[PDB]
């Protein structure tokens, strides 16, 4: 009676696989693989998908389906960033994947991904009352409102940690004024999503890094993190810490901080901070499950 499923997310830089199955009522992850192909390389400036990248990605996709079929998972979905939509060869690519790897890839919007992530949260955390999943990412953050497995509304804010960090922070670490204009802005933009909620669930690399931080979880374990709480205080404690030091010292002194995140992580912490303010809340619940797991959730 056991049914196994798998999901494959083709990101702008990574490709991920996740096969799982359902006993009676429980769903569990049996494997998680991921490889960097950087399929998104120079897409914006060239309006093209580099052939070698496409080549590298396709090989991995096959490498992946080898496992899918292996576990004979009778249900497989594959999605891709819409970022690749700016490439003329985007459809051509999608085509090749179809016959060369025998795989149907659905490009999805930043809102759709929000919807998927939200679903992963409804199953892994079973939130109560009105819930708002806040998925802060590198390109942008999505606020997803709903009840149970029902999605009310999804709003996607252009507030990408990278550009947001390039704009307001001109020094590493930044100056007090900079941090101030940063929050004025955050305020303006965030007041737009303000809605009455009961439980705010936190998502993304920044906030799970923050949990590991707060709970002294070094070798990353997604059980000592998932479902953990993060009061406004614990969060403000760490914003304060980092703000006082340059991206590098954060990387050096704190093992859970990925060099790639080390810098931008300030603004990321900021968003979560100001959000609790606007939504007037003392804390939020952190989730290790997101898009990749949310896709599987759908059945
Ligand atoms: N370890 C590692 N991870 C990488 C690297 N590059 C990207 N990632 C992770 O993979 C996702 C971003 O790239 P993709 O896989 O292409 O996904 P995407 O195009 O939809 O953004 C994010 O995972 P995420 O945490 O689920 O989303 P996020 O909130 O950080 O954005 C990001 O942190 C890398 O070089 N090393």
TrEMBL record:
One of its GO terms (molecular function) is pyrophosphatase activity. The keyword Metal-binding applies. Signal peptide: none annotated. Residues 18-299 form the Ppx/GppA phosphatase N-terminal domain. InterPro entries: ATPase_NBD (IPR043129), GppA/Ppx_hydrolase (IPR050273), Ppx_GppA_N (IPR003695). Gene3D superfamilies: 3.30.420.40, Exopolyphosphatase. Domain 2. The modification Cysteine sulfenic acid (-SOH) is found at residue 283. Residues 54-100 form a coiled coil. Ca(2+) binds at residues 137, 140, 142. Keywords: Calcium, Coiled coil, Metal-binding. This is Exopolyphosphatase. It comes from Aquifex aeolicus (strain VF5). The lineage of its organism: Bacteria, Pseudomonadati, Aquificota, Aquificia, Aquificales. The gene is ppx.
């Amino acid at each position: 009676p056991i049914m196994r499923v798998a999901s494959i997310d083709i990101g702008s830089n990574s490709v991920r696989l996740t096969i799982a199955q359902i006993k009676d009522g429980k769903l569990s992850i049996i494997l998680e693989r991921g490889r960097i192909t950087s399929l998104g390389t120079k897409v914006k400036e060239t309006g093209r998908l580099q052939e070698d990248r496409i080549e590298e990605t396709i090989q991995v996709l096959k490498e992946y389906k080898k496992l899918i079929d292996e576990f004979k998972v009778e249900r497989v979905k594959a999605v891709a960033t819409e970022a690749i939509r700016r490439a003329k060869n985007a459809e051509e690519f999608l085509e090749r994947v179809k016959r060369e790897v025998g795989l149907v890839v659905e490009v999805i919007t930043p809102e759709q991904e929000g919807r998927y992530a939200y679903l992963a949260v409804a199953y892994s955390l079973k939130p109560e009352g009105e819930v708002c999943v806040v998925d802060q990412g590198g390109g942008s953050t999505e606020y997803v409102f709903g009840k149970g497995y029902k999605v009310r509304e999804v709003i996607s804010l252009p507030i990408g940690i990278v550009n947001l960090t390039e704009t307001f922070f001109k020094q590493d670490p930044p100056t007090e004024e900079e941090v101030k204009r940063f929050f004025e802005f955050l305020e303006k933009e965030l007041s737009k999503v303000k809605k009455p909620v009961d439980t705010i669930v936190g998502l993304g690399g920044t906030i799970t890094t923050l949990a590991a931080l707060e709970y002294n979880v070094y070798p990353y374990d997604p059980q000592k993190v998932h479902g953990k709480v993060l009061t406004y205080g614990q969060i403000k404690k760490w914003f304060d810490t980092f703000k006082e030091i340059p991206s590098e010292e954060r990387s050096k002194r704190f093992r859970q901080v990925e060099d790639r995140r080390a810098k931008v992580i300030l603004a990321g912490i900021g968003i979560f901070l100001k959000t609790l303010e606007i939504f007037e809340k003392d804390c939020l619940i952190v989730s290790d499950w997101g898009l990749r797991e949310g896709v599987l959730v759908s059945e």
